[PDB]
């Protein structure tokens, strides 16, 4: 409905975080971003340049389909934070058993700087098929990018940096190379007293 779901895969939960070990049995976890009436539509040609234009690129993936698998996620990240682990945990569900591949492309000024792949086998669960990417360590680029942002003294300076910083996540059926889900991520700094916020949009032409 308002879910990040295509015809074959559904992302139930997504979250980036910093976990600090206070003592041998105490762990503090800070959530930077988290997912878990109807979805507003967005013209993909408005964000096209912010992502790399190439074979395998966003325009090339959208044009090959299925168009029901494309989303744009606007995140307002919680940066109020002070042993350390930086990680990403995601949960997908499918009605069919598959071997999925989730590729993440970190982009600065539209050009890809970093990329990581994960491959997940289905875990049968109550007639559903689960894919749980549990504590995928955040790359050094991101950890050093979160660090640099925190050094700027005012949030306007921080958002200014994030107007040329995006992430593209392409979850693919490994054997068939079908686009299962393709999420485009844009960021701002949260000012909310209720933690990290987000807006999900369906990408259209």
């Amino acid at each position: 409905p308002r879910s990040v779901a295509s015809s074959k895969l559904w992302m139930l939960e997504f979250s980036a975080f910093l976990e600090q070990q206070q003592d041998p049995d105490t762990y503090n976890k800070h959530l930077f971003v988290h997912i878990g009436p109807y979805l507003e539509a967005v013209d993909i040609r408005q964000i096209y340049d912010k992502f790399p234009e190439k074979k395998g690129g966003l325009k090339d993936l959208f044009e090959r389909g299925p168009s029901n698998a494309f989303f744009l996620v606007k995140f307002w990240a919680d940066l109020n934070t002070n042993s350390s682990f930086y990680g990403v945990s995601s949960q997908y569900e499918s009605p069919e058993n598959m071997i999925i591949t989730c590729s993440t492309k970190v982009c600065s000024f539209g050009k890809q700087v970093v990329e990581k792949v994960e491959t997940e086998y289905a875990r049968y669960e109550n007639g559903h098929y689960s894919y749980r990417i549990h504590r995928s360590p955040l790359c050094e680029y991101m950890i050093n990018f979160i660090h640099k942002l925190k050094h700027l003294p005012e949030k306007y300076m921080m958002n200014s940096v994030l107007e040329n910083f995006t992430i593209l996540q392409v979850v693919t059926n490994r054997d068939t190379q079908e686009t299962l889900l393709c999420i485009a991520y844009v960021f701002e700094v949260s000012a909310s007293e209720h933690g990290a916020q987000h807006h999900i949009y369906r990408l259209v032409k």
């Binding site: 967005v42 701002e188 807006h199």
Partner: peptide
């Protein structure tokens, strides 16, 4: 084109 000047819903710039 500035992100605030692009053809995007008003909510894009309005945090929930």
């Amino acid at each position: 084109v500035p992100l605030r000047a692009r053809n995007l819903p008003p909510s894009f710039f309005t945090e929930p």
